[PDB]
Subunit: 384 residues, 3 copies
């Protein structure tokens, strides 16, 4: 059904990853994932057979409310990251721990401190970050999970644990790096930023990190093709950082839609008519070719370009769109949606738009759990 | 009811035109047009009387799905254009053939190649574009349609038939230009770009067209007053091109609302609270002054500024807003909407928002076919 | 409940003001205001006790339609301002008269001339602005009202009473200033602009005002923190104007939401996920810390910073949100909301969105009329 062009220069070690952080709560809500034949098959088995060497997991320090009701988004905590890393190691895939350093979503607008860290001074907030990182990674490695990468923040574009000063922000990053660097010399320290379209942003960030002597190994970028610029920019800006500051580069989040349809009753973020550059048809091929070309752009940077991660490759519907009341009840109980009512105290946007998945049409599996043909793009970049 | 300030510098042959491409789908759906007295009258009779010398038609190569179902938007093909061009030529009106070179709406965001050309290579695309242009213009000429202009694309702001490369785009542009130039030395070659407000865009576009040696006679702009900036800009950016690159200039699309109301039950594009600069009142007089002032801005270029086309002056409601279900039938069955469901395969936006006209409140005819007093702006710009 | 950080630089006569222009229509809709103990108490008493020293009122020349149906927004006229100002002076508060010189909302996009002045020529409009200012302030001053401040226009960013030409704008500004100057030497002539984030804007405006010899005393800015940029911009740009042209600076409108929730059934204007910079929590404390921070940004200007006015601190709901049909009647028949259907003739945005309050979550009073802790920010800015 799907054919994609061969990407030139892919290493054998090129990181073909997926962030499946929603898996547990989907599974806690009775989602079932099959294979191409229609037989039940663990998503991580299917993922292996498709060529994926890596899994990315988000960790929130307390993604739950006062009475324990979960904020949503898969209620991603250490326990779920430990399960996912266990499941990922069994299937022969290395892990990336995306520490939000927040009790819920961290983006460029929302980089809130955890509730526990809210009342602390900059000095004490610095040591909790260090301890949280250290202790969390330590329990992970006790459960023999292969971590090749740890991320100090998610889209820390000018904010990080409540701080807007780059000087305070850099000091916080080095605390995470120190924990990582003490846990193992061979866990790469990843830094995550988005909006690569904005002119000069990635050059200025990289300077500011160098001027404030942050120890990082990978400068990572979100490149969602509908919001984050031309493919050429990605390669060029990523090249600058790697070539000028002798760092590695990779893409931490990409995704493209395969259907205009919604599978759960909660509006999905793309396609949309006004705010998004849609250069690839909204079909399963167009999806696959965007994943291909993002892999090419990272590759075209050079030996610096080391990988691409897809983001939520299976936030599939917990139920058909008609069964919304039933779906809502699942979303609230197990946080199988993007957010739940219980996040309204912590994330303003959740109060208004609590619900299900906004990415069920940008997943690489179909609404009923069987894999789409676009999931085979991670093999096809080496072949064609 | 309405008066307007005279425009100085209007040539006897100044192009006072309207793009009435919805007429056939509206007529097939039961919409009927009248005169000011109130008796039934063909829109081209009324239009001729109002002083219009030109009609503009859009041509999509196959504006239909596989089973023959129209994409909507008037289901505009060669056949509907030939009808319109004959009807126009009967009423003393020259025709402008706007080739989208797509199977649906072509805009800066969407320049999807025709389904047949989608699987072609660059060299074949270039050959088909020539042939389609030559054959299509030939059929019209055989029917003795008087064609004065042909557009090679619609708002080709850095896209054209699936191409984002200005070298490749100009090559494709020249293909059409050749067919026009072979058919007659007396059919002007219009090139259509939009967003005049953006600083430097029309100057850089014109430069690329000279560097890559494109043959065009007219540099056309879209100027909807709510989206595209000052009247002074339009005149200056169109003048620069005219005197620097020795080309003529015109406005190919302009519209303004006369009511805030919706007449068909599909949300209208303007007026809007957030995104639009509405400097004229949303009244029939406000409409008329907007048009007059866009006619003056073009005439303020001088002898290069050759005309103003109003876009969809008569996309009037196929049924009252309370007859929506009956309207949905006509919208789908006859293409009397902006897009039907059958475009969801080609246009992502159609699946989300299929339905009727969003420019019914910007028409120079009222909801029930009777010409508005603003239709005489084309008359009054000379008398005063 | 709430604490705030003290502000250094704070005169004894620093202006701690509120725009309570919605009060009569809300009171005319049975909205009732209480104290902190649940005991009915005039809003102006509670306002006085909270540290507030100033009230701002908005004057529309005819906030009503043809048949006397009020446009909305508090149906604010000279009579309502004389009531509000009277009640202001009784509770020890000086007044600011914001003249929109429009029959409804005056903003950067909408600066419509009053209906009576709409058919007038430029010169007649200058006398009419002058008489209106003179006679309106004369009636006020005959009722004991202490006017310390008169504002000529509301956010006159390139448009004022119908004119988009800075030359004609300035002449009109000098018309009102004269009548204030002719009313009393001590009343302060305020000029009001918004979007300070845009680079160059306030410095540009300030030259034009000086180059065209406008008599003003205060350069006033709108600073809503979710749309208008950094606090350092506010201080910088206000500093520059005040130090470069020897004027005074102040913030005339600022506000921040205390709840995600709506109280009256009409969508509120912030918080919003899609397009705003919310850097304070959507809680009463975050509200309080925002107001403090805009006081410190004005304070940081120097002695030029003369105060900050909170906007509509009490546009609380007429009735709980489920009571929508019953609410509409009050909004429509008392102008208890931002606009009513009768305004659709004058302001297009009213046709689409006529209704109730979009600031009810940004009020310093709760949904049931009791003060919120943040209303005491004006006390705590000197204490801590
Ligand atoms: Ca969904
Ligand atoms: Ca409509
Ligand atoms: Ca409301």
């Amino acid at each position: 059904d799907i054919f994609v062009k061969r990407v030139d220069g892919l290493s054998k070690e090129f990181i073909k990853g997926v962030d499946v952080s929603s898996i547990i709560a989907l599974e806690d809500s009775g989602v079932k994932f099959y294979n191409a034949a229609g037989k039940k098959q663990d998503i991580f088995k299917t993922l292996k057979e498709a060529g994926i060497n890596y899994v990315r997991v988000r960790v929130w320090n307390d993604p739950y409310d006062a009475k324990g009701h979960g904020y949503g988004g898969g209620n991603n905590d250490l326990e779920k990251a430990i399960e996912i890393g266990k499941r990922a190691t069994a299937s022969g895939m290395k892990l990336l721990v995306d520490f939000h350093y927040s009790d819920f979503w961290a983006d460029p607008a929302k980089q809130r401190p955890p509730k526990a860290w809210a009342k602390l001074n900059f000095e004490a907030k610095k040591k909790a970050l260090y301890r949280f990182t250290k202790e969390s990674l330590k329990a992970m490695l006790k459960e023999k999970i292969q971590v090749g990468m740890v991320q100090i923040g998610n889209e820390t574009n000018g904010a990080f644990v409540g701080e807007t000063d780059w000087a305070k922000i850099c000091e916080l990053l080095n605390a995470g790096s120190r924990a990582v660097r003490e846990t193992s010399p061979n866990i790469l320290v990843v830094l995550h930023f988005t909006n690569p379209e904005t002119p000069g942003r990635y050059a200025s960030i990289a300077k500011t990190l160098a001027e404030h002597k942050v120890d990082y190994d990978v400068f990572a970028s979100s490149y969602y093709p509908f919001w984050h610029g031309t493919l050429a920019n990605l390669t060029s800006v990523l090249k600058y950082v790697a070539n000028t500051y002798l760092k590695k580069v990779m893409v931490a989040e990409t995704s493209y839609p395969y259907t205009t349809e919604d599978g759960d009753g909660h509006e999905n973020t793309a396609p949309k008519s006004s705010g998004q550059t849609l250069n690839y048809p909204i079909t399963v091929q167009g999806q696959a070719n965007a994943i291909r070309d993002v892999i090419q752009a990272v590759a075209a940077v050079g030996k610096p370009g080391i990988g691409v991660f897809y983001w939520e490759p299976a936030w599939i519907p917990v139920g058909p769109p008609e069964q919304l009341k039933q779906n809502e009840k699942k979303w609230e109980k197990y946080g199988s949606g993007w957010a739940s009512s219980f996040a309204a105290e912590y994330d303003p946007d959740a109060a208004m738009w609590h619900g299900g998945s906004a990415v069920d049409n940008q997943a690489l599996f179909d609404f009923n759990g069987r894999p789409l043909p676009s999931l085979n793009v991670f093999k096809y970049v080496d072949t064609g």
